[PDB]
Short mmCIF file of C-alpha atoms and ligand atoms in Angstrom, two decimals:
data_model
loop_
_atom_site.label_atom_id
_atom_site.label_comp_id
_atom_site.label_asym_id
_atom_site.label_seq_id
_atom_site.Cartn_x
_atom_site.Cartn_y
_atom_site.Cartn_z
CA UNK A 23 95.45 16.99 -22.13
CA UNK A 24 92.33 15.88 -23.84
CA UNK A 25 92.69 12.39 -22.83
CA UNK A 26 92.74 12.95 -19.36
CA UNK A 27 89.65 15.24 -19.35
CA UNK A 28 87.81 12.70 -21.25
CA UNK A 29 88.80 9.85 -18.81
CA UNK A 30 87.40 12.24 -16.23
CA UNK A 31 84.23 12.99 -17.84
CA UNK A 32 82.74 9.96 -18.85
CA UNK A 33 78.74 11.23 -17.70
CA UNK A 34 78.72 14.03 -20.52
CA UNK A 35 79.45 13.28 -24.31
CA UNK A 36 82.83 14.97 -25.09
CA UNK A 37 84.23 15.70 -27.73
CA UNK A 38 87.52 17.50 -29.10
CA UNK A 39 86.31 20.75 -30.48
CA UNK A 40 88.21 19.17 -33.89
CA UNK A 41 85.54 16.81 -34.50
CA UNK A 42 83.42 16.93 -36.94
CA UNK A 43 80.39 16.75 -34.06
CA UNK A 44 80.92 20.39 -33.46
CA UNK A 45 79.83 20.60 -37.10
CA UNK A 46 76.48 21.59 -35.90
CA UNK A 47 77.69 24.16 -33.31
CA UNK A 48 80.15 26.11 -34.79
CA UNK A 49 83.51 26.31 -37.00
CA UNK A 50 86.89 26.36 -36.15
CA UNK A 51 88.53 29.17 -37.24
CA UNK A 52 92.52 28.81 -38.99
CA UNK A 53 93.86 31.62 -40.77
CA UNK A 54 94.10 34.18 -38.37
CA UNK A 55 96.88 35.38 -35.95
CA UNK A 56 96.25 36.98 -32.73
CA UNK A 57 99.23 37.77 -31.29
CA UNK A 58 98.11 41.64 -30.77
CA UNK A 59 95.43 40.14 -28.69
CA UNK A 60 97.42 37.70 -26.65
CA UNK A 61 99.55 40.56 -25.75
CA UNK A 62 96.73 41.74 -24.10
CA UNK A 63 95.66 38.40 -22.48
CA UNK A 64 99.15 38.14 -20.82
CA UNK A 65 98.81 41.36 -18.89
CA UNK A 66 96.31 39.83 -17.05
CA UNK A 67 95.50 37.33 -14.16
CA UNK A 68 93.28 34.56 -13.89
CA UNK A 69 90.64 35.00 -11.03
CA UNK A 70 90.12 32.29 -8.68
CA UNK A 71 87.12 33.49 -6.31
CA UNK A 72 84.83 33.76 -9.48
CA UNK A 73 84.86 34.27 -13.59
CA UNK A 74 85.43 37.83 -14.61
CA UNK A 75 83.97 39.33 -18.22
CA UNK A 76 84.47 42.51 -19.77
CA UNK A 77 82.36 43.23 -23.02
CA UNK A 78 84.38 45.20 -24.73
CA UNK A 79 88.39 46.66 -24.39
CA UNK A 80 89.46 49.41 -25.65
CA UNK A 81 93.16 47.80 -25.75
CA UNK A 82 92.32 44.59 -27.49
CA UNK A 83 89.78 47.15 -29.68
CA UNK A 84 92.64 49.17 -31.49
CA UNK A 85 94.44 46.37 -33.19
CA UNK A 86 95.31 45.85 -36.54
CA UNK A 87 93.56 42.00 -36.14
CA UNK A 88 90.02 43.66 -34.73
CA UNK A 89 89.42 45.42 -38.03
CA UNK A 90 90.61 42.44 -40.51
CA UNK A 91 87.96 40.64 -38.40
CA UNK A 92 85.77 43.50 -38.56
CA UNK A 93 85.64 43.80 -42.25
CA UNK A 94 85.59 40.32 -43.13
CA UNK A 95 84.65 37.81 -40.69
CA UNK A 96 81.78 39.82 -39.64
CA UNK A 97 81.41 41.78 -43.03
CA UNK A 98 82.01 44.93 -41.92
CA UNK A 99 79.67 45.34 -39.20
CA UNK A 100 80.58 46.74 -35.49
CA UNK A 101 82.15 44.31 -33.45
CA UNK A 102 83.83 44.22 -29.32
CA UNK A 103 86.77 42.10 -28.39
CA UNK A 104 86.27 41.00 -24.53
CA UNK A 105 87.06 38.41 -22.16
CA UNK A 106 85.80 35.81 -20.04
CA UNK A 107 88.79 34.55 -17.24
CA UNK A 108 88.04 32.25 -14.06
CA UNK A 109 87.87 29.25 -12.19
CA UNK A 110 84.47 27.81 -13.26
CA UNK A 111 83.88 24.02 -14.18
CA UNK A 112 80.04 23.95 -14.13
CA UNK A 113 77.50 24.41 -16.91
CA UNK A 114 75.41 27.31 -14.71
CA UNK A 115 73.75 28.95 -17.67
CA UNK A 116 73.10 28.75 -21.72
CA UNK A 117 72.49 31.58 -23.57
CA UNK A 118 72.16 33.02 -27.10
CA UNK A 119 72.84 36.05 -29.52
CA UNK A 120 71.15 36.63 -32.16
CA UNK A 121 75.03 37.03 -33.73
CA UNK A 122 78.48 35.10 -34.21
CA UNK A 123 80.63 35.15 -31.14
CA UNK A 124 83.95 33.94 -31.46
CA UNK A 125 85.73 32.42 -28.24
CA UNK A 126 90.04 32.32 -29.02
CA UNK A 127 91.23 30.04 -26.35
CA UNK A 128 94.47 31.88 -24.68
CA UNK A 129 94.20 28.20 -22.25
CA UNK A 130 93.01 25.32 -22.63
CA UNK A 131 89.53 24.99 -21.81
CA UNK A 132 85.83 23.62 -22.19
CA UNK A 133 82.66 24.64 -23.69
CA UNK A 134 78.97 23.02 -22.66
CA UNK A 135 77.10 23.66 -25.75
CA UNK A 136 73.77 23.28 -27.12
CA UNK A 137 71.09 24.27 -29.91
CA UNK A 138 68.54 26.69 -29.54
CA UNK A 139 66.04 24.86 -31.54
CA UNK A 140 66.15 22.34 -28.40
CA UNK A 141 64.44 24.77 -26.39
CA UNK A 142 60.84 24.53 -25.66
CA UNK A 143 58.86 26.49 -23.64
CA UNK A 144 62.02 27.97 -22.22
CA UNK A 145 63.26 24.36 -20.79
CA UNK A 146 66.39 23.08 -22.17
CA UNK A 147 67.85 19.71 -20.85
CA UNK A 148 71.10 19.19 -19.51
CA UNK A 149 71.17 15.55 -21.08
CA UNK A 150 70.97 17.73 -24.55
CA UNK A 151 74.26 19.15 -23.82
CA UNK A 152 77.84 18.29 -25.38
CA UNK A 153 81.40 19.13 -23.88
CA UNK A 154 83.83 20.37 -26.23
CA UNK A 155 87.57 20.50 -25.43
CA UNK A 156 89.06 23.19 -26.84
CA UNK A 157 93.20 23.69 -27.11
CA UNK A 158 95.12 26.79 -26.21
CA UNK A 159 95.32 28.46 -29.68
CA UNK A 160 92.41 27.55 -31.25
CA UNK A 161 89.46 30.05 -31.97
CA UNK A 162 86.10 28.93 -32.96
CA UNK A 163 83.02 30.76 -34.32
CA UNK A 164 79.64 29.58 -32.29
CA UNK A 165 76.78 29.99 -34.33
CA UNK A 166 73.96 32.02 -33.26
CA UNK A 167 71.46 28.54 -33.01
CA UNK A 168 74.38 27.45 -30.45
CA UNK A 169 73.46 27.56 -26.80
CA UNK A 170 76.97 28.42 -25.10
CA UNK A 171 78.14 30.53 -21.56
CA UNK A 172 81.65 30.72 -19.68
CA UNK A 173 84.15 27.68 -20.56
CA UNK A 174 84.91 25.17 -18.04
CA UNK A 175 88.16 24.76 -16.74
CA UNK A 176 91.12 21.88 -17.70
CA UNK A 177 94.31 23.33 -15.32
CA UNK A 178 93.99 24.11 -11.88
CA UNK A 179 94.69 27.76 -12.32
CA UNK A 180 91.30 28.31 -14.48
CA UNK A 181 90.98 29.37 -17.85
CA UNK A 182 91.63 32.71 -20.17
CA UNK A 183 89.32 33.17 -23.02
CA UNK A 184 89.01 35.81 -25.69
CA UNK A 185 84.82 36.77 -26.31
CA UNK A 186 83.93 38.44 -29.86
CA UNK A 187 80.85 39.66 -30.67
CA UNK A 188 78.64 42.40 -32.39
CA UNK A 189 79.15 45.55 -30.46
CA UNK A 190 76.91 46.21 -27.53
CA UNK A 191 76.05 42.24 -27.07
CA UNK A 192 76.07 41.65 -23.69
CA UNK A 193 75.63 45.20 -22.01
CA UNK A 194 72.71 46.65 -19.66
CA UNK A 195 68.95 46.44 -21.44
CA UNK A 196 68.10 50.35 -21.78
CA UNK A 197 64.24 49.49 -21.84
CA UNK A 198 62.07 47.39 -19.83
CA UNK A 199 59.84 45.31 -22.91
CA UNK A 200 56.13 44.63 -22.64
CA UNK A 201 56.99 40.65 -22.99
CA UNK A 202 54.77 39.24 -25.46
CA UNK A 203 56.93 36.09 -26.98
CA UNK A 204 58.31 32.71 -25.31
CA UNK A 205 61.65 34.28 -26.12
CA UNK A 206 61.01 37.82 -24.70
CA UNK A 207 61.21 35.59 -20.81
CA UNK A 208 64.59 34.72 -21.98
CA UNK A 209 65.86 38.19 -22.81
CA UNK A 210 68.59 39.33 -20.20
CA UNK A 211 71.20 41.96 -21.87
CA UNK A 212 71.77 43.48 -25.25
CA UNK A 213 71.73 41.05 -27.69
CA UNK A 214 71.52 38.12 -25.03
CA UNK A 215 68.82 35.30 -24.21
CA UNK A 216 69.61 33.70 -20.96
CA UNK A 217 68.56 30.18 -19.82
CA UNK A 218 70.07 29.27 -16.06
CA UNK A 219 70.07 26.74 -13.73
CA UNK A 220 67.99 27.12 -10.80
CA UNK A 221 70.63 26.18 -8.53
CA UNK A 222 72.42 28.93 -9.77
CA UNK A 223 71.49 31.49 -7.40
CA UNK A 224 73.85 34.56 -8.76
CA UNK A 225 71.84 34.49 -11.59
CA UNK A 226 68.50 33.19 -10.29
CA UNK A 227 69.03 36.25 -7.81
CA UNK A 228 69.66 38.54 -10.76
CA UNK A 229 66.39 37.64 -12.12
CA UNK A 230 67.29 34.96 -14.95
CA UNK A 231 64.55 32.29 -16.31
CA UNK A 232 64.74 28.94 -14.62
CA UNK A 233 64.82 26.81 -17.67
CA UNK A 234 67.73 24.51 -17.55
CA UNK A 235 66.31 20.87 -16.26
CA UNK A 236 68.64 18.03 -15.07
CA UNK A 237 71.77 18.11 -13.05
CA UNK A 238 73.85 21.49 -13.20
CA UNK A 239 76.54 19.64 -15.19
CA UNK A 240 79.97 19.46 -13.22
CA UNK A 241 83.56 19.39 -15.44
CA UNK A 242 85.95 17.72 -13.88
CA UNK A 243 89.95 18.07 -13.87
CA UNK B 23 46.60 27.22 -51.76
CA UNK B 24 48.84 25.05 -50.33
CA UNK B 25 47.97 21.90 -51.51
CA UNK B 26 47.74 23.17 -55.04
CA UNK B 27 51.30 24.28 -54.71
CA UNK B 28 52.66 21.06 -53.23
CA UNK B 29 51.15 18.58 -55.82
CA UNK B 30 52.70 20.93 -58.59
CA UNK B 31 56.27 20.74 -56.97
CA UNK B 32 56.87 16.89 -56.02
CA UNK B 33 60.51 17.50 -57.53
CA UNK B 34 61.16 19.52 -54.27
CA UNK B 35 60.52 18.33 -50.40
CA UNK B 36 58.22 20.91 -49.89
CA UNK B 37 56.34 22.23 -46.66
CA UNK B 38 53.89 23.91 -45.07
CA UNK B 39 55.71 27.03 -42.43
CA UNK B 40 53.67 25.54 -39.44
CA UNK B 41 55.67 22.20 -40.13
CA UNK B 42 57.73 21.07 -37.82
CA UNK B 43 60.60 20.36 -40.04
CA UNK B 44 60.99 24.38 -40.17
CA UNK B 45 62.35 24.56 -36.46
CA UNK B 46 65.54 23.69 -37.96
CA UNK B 47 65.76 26.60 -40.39
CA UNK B 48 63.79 29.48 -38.30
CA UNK B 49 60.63 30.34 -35.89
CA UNK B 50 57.39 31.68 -37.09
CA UNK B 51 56.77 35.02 -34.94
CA UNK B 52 53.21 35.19 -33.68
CA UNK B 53 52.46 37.68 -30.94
CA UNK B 54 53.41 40.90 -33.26
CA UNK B 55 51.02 42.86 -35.08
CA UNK B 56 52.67 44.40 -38.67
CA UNK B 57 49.34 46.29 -39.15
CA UNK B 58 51.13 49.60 -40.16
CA UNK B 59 53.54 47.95 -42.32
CA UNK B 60 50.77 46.14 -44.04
CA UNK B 61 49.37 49.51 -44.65
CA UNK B 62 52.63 50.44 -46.57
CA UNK B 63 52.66 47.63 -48.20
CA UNK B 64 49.04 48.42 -49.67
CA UNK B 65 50.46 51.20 -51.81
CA UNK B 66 52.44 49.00 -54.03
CA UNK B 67 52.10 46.95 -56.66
CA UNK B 68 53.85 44.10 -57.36
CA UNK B 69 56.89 44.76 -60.34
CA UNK B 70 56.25 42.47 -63.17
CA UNK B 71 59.84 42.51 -65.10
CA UNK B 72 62.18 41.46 -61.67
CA UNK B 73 62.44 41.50 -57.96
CA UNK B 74 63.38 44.77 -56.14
CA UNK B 75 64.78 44.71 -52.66
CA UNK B 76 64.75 48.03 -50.90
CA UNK B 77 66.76 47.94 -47.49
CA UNK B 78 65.72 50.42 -45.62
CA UNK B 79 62.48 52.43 -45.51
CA UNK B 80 62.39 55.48 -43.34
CA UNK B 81 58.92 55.64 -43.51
CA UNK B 82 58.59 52.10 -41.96
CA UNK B 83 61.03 51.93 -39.45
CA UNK B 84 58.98 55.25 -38.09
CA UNK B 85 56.79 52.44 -37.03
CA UNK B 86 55.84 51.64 -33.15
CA UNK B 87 56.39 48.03 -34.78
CA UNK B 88 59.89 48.95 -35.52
CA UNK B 89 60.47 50.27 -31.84
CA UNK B 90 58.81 46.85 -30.41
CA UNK B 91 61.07 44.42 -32.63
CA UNK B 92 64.74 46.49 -32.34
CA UNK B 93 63.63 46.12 -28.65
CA UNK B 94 62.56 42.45 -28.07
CA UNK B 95 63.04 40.95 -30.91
CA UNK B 96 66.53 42.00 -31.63
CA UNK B 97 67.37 42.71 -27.89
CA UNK B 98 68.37 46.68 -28.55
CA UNK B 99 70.13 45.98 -31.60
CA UNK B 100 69.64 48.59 -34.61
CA UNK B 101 67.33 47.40 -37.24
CA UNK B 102 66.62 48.55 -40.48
CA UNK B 103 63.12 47.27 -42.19
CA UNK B 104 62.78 47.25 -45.93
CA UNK B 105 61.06 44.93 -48.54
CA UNK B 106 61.25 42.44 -51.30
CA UNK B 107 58.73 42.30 -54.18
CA UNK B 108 58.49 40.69 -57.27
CA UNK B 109 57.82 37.77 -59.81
CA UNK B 110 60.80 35.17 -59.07
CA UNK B 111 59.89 31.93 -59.10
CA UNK B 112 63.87 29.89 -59.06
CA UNK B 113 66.39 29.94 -56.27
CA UNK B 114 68.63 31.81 -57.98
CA UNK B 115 71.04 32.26 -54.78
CA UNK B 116 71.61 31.39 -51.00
CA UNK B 117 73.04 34.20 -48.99
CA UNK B 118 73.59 34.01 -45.12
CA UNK B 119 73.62 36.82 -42.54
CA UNK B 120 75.63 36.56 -39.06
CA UNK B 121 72.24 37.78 -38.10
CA UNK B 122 68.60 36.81 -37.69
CA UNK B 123 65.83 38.12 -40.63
CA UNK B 124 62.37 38.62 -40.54
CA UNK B 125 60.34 37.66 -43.51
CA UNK B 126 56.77 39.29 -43.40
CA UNK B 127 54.48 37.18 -46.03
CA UNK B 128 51.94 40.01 -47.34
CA UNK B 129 51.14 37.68 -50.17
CA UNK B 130 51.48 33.39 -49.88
CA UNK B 131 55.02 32.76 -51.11
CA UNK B 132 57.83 30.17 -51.07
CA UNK B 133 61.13 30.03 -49.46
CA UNK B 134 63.96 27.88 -50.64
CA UNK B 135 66.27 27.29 -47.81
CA UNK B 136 69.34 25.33 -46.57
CA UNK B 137 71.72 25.20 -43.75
CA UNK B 138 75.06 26.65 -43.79
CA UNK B 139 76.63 23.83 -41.97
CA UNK B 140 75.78 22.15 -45.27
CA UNK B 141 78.56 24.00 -47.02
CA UNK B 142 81.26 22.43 -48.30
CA UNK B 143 84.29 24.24 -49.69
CA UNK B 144 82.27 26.50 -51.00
CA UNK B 145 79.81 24.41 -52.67
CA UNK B 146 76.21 23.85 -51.48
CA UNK B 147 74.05 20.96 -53.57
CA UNK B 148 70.62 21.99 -54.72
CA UNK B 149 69.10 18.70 -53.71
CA UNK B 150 70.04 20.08 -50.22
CA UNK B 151 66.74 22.61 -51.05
CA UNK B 152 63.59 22.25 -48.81
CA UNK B 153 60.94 24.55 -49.49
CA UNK B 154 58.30 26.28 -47.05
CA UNK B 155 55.13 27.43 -47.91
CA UNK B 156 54.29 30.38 -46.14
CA UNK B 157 50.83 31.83 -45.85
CA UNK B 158 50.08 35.31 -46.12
CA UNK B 159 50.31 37.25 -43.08
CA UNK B 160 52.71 34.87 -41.89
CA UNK B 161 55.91 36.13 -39.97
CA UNK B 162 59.08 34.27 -39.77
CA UNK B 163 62.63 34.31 -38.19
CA UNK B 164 65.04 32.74 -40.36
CA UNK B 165 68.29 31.92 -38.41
CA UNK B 166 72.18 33.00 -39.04
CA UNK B 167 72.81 29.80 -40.19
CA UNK B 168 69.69 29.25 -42.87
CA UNK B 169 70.60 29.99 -46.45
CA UNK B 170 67.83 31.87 -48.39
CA UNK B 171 67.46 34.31 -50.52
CA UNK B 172 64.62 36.16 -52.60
CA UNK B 173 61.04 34.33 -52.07
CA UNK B 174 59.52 32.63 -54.71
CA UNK B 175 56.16 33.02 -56.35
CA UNK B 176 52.20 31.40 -55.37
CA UNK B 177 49.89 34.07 -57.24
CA UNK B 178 50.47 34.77 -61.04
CA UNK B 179 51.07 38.66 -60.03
CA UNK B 180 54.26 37.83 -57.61
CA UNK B 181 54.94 38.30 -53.96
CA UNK B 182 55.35 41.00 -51.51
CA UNK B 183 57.61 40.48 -48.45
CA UNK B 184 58.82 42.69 -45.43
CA UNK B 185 62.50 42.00 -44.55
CA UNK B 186 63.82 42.94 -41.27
CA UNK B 187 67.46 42.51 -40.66
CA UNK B 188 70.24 44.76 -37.89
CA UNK B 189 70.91 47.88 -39.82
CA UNK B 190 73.34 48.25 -42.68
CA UNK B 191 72.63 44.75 -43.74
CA UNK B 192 73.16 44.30 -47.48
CA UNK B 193 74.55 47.98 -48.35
CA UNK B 194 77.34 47.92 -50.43
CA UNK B 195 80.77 46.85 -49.12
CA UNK B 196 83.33 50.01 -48.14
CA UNK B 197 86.38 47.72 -47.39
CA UNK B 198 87.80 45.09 -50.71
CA UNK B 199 89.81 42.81 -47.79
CA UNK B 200 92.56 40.69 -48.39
CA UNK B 201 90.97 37.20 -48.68
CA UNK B 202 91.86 34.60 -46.08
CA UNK B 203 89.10 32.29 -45.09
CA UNK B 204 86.84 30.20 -47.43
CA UNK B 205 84.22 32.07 -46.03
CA UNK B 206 85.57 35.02 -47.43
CA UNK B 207 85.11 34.10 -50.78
CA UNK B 208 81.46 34.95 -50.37
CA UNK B 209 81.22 38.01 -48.59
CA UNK B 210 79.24 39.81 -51.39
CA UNK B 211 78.02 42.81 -49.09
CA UNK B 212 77.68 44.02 -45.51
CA UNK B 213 76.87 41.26 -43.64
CA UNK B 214 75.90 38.82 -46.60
CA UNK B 215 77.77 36.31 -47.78
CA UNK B 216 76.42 34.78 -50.83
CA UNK B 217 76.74 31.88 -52.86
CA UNK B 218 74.92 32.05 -55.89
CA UNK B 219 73.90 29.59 -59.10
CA UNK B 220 75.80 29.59 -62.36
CA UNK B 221 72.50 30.34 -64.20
CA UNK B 222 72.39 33.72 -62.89
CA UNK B 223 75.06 35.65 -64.72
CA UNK B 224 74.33 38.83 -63.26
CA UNK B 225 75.22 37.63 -60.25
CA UNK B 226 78.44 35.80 -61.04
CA UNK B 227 79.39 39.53 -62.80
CA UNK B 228 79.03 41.21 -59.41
CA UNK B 229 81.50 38.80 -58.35
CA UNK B 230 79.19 36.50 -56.94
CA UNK B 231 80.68 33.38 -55.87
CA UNK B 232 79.47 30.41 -58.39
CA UNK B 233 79.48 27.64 -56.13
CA UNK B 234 75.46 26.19 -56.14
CA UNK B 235 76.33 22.39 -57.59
CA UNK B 236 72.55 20.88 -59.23
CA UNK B 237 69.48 22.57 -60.68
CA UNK B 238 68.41 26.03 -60.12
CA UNK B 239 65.60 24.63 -58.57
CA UNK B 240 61.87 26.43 -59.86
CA UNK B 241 58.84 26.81 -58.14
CA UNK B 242 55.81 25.99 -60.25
CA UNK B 243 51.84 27.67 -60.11
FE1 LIG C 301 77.96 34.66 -25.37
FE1 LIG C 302 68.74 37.87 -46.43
#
């Protein structure tokens, strides 16, 4: 229940993902069904030791609702159908594509957001950031200016979460860049700018900038 | 000049690229040299009657340039590079991409942007219009949620721009999809969605989506 999270969360603004504050961030998304997806979802099980993603399945890939989605939500241009399951509740990371994802809540869950034009020299601040509760059943598109990672939990069991996106977003870089840009520090997969928190030493460790400043916000439940 | 430009447009907040009131709308690039595209770019001459947009051009995307910005830039994601010439001087049209653009300025020009989020039912207000000055030799990003369109004119002859955008962008849709989502309405080809000024029949014939409320907005010199 919103309420409760709210109640809990009173050091963050929060926000239901309904409000028009998310506006900025992204759209909520109404006229779709995605019950050849949740099919899918319901096969599997939630991890508790740490989140699990997986870029792009082949299952959730041959549906009728991946191509309507193909065609017109992202005007005909390749997309993947993931997803992003676990027991997480802290912020950890922001990062950006230079694309839509969509995120189709199969729980309840939240997202720590922000905006990309807050960044400068590769330091974003955790004060900057916004919770956004999001219902079982609702899918939202996050802008590409929308700073986003793995939802936050609400139940005790974790949280399932369905992760669209251009195809190949998100796997191994095949190249190693001269870097030449502020940005370039950022890049960290296909299609993916990564900003962590350096108490976050599974990414830290995996070689991801240091840029988020201020306390590794904590969700509570 | 610049400051010729502004003092002739005072019906339009109007701005120089390097402002900071751009962040919101895109990022000027600065580390990248466009020296063999320039060199392209040399062998044409501006057309005098209308724009002309080509897509894709084989001969510049056979660029080390190209390599360097599908790497970095776009993080591995395909890129075509094409260009946009002409004598326009009105808005005309805003059209998003769920993508980022380059704009390469070979000649000073204008840009007439807005934000998506600034959509409403499928109406954007032309008051909602800032315009950026943009030198020549200056490159930008414009972000997936800035509406823009063709640039307009400084110099009597016209403009010449490069436009960089992930590959297939703007061909001509293969799917007609069964409409669902406002934002459907203006999908007007791959990866564009459109919504254009009643002035500018030819667009409106297409199918184009009439939905820019206010004057379409001109660009004096
Ligand atoms: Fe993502
Ligand atoms: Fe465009």
């Amino acid at each position: 229940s919103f309420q409760y999270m709210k109640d809990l969360n009173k050091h963050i603004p929060f926000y239901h993902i309904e409000d028009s504050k998310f506006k900025h961030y992204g759209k909520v998304i109404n006229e779709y069904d995605f019950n050849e997806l949740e099919t899918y979802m319901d096969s599997l099980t939630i991890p508790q030791d740490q989140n699990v993603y997986v870029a792009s399945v082949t299952e959730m890939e041959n549906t009728i609702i991946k191509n309507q989605l193909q065609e017109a939500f992202y005007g005909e241009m390749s997309i993947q159908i993931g997803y992003c399951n676990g027991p997480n509740s802290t912020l950890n990371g922001l990062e950006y594509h230079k694309s839509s994802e969509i995120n189709i809540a199969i729980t309840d869950m939240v997202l720590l957001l922000g905006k990309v034009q807050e960044v400068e020299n590769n330091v974003f601040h955790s004060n900057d950031v916004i919770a956004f509760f999001v219902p079982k059943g609702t899918a939202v598109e996050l802008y590409s200016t929308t700073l986003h990672f793995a939802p936050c939990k609400v139940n005790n069991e974790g949280f399932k979460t369905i992760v669209i996106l251009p195809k190949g977003t998100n796997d191994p870089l095949s190249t190693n860049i001269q870097k030449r840009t502020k940005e370039d520090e950022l890049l960290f997969m296909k299609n993916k700018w990564l900003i962590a928190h350096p108490e976050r030493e599974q990414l830290i460790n995996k070689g991801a900038h240091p840029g988020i400043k201020g306390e590794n916000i904590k969700v509570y439940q």
